[PDB]
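Illustration 12: Tetratricopeptide repeat protein.
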Amino acid sequence: MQNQQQKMQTILIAQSQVYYYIREGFWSTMQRFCQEQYKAFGDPFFIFWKAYGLYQEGLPNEAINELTSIQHKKEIQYATIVALITYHLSTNIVDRETVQNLKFEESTQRRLSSDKAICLAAFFYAFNKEHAKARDLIDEIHSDNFNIRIASAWCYLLEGGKFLEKSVQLFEELYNEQHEINKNLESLMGRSKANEMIKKFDISLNTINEINVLYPDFKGGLIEKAKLLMTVDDWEQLVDYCNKILYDDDKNIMALMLLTFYTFAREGDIETGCERLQKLIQAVEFSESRNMQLMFKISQVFSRISGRNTQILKFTMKLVNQCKQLSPLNAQYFCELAQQLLMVNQFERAEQYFQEASAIDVDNKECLMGLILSKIMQGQTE
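Figure caption equivalent — predicted structure in token form:
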């Protein structure tokens, strides 16, 4: 019995790691960690979240292929059907017959599914920002199971707003019902995040310290501690704990971003900052080669603080050109690229890219305003 309980606890820890990463969105890490955990245990949960991470990277077909291997698994069948519906709707060529058949299967399986599958599907709805459907799925479950209450609290936290308080209450109740050292990881994460949102930073810091003490193997606690110190502008402790994390494991994208931002924003060292940006670029291309959003965010961050330094802007524009190459129909990339050409005072090319983006998206205010701006600097004030 002890061995089975230990294995169940390890599986729960792996699932909590997956959920933390989902709140962090490391999709290649999704795939790698989920693949290794599925090889170790064989739980279709990991394959499902690997498919979800594939979907988040813009590969609905691979996600569908991964999901079809675990559709007939009774434990996650309803959630698999729901996510297959979503992914098929997200494809360029939508198979309407398959979507209708999957919708009928969902309607049939909703009544025959276990509470675990319903909670899992509610997780998928909530993470896809479909909070109403997640809340509807949770509220249909009348079981007083500890994991189901954790699911309810997490869904209510993700929805936020008027439900937020209730979620906190649940996260408190689950806190009080556990043994002294038996505190659930996900409940502590929810409590810390909720306290951060209501700007009760002391409680969040204490909760994260408790998380780090109780779960030393779990590395998410240190990373979210560094993030919380970023929130409260505690940069010295952030550097110390990021250095500790890198001492435990190197080649981390977030740590490289933090170090490069530190060098650019406070030290002002252009050469070292450029080297750190370069190494971050290699890390991204090695692990997040198809992550358009991540590269776009990196370029925006390092262009807004570059002070119009041509060296940094070269890396940022290279990143934006890569994003444009893999996504030619997104006008946001053109707006960003021509804005970066603006910080290098290349007004004509900026106007050209802005016209192209306005052709892609007529209602995009950003390139319209920037077209006005470029006409201003080019001298056509009228």
